[PDB]
């Protein structure tokens, strides 16, 4: 009996408004602003698969953050049988 | 006063 409220299904509205951003009954839909009104870093975000260890720079925190996760993955693989 | 091969 419990579910989410009905979602929109209009391409025009779904591409011109952020439908679920406004959660209040008395509020209005949040209109999408023009491209010039959004920060530059938004459009440089990685929309694809995660960067691999080879792509990452060995002097960045991202490189060593990736190696630590891989070592944790290896530890879990080795521990499973142990 | 101990030589190279001195042993206590």
């Amino acid at each position: 009996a419990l579910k989410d409220p009905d979602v929109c299904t209009d391409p025009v509205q779904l591409t011109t408004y952020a439908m679920g951003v406004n959660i209040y009954k008395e509020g209005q839909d949040v209109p999408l602003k023009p491209d010039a009104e959004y920060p530059e870093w938004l459009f440089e975000m990685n929309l694809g698969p995660p960067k691999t260890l080879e792509e990452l720079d060995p002097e960045s925190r991202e490189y060593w953050r990736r190696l630590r996760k891989q070592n944790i993955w290896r530890h879990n693989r080795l521990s499973k049988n142990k | 006063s101990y030589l190279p091969g001195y042993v206590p």
């Binding site: 060995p58 002097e59 960045s60 925190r61 490189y63 060593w64 | -």
Partner: protein, 130 residues
């Protein structure tokens, strides 16, 4: 035993050696508190109340920060770093805010640091605040 070829410095150390330089060059207040074992919620909350006045909380390993200080001008800050050591670094001396936030926790010791290239004690800060 023949010594072993010295292990080549890891790239993270270099990044840490560069971020320490930056924190130490581009900030003015550099307090040095002992990172006591407050709960995760409390540590996050006290770090949000300090960030209200944009007073950052750094944490650097004592095996990178010490070499740096040894070879740097801050050669008298070494004794402080015996144990867990967080840095409370702000870009403009906001001591009174830090001090009142730091006084909410009776057991968290403010050990000292260096404001405006002057190594102070705890009372130095409490005096610079007044």
């Amino acid at each position: 035993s023949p010594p072993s070829p010295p292990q080549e410095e890891i790239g993270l150390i270099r990044l840490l050696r560069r971020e320490i330089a930056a924190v130490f060059q581009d900030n003015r207040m550099i307090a040095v508190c002992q990172n006591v074992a407050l709960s995760a919620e409390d540590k996050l909350l006290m770090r949000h109340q300090l960030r209200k006045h944009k007073i950052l909380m750094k944490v650097f390993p004592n095996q990178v920060l010490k070499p740096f200080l040894e070879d740097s001008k801050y050669q008298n800050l070494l004794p402080l770093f015996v144990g867990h050591n967080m840095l409370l670094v702000s870009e403009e001396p906001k001591v009174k805010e830090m001090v009142r936030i730091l006084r909410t926790v009776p057991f968290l010791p403010l050990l000292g640091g260096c404001i405006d290239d002057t190594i102070l004690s705890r009372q130095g800060f409490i005096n610079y605040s007044k």
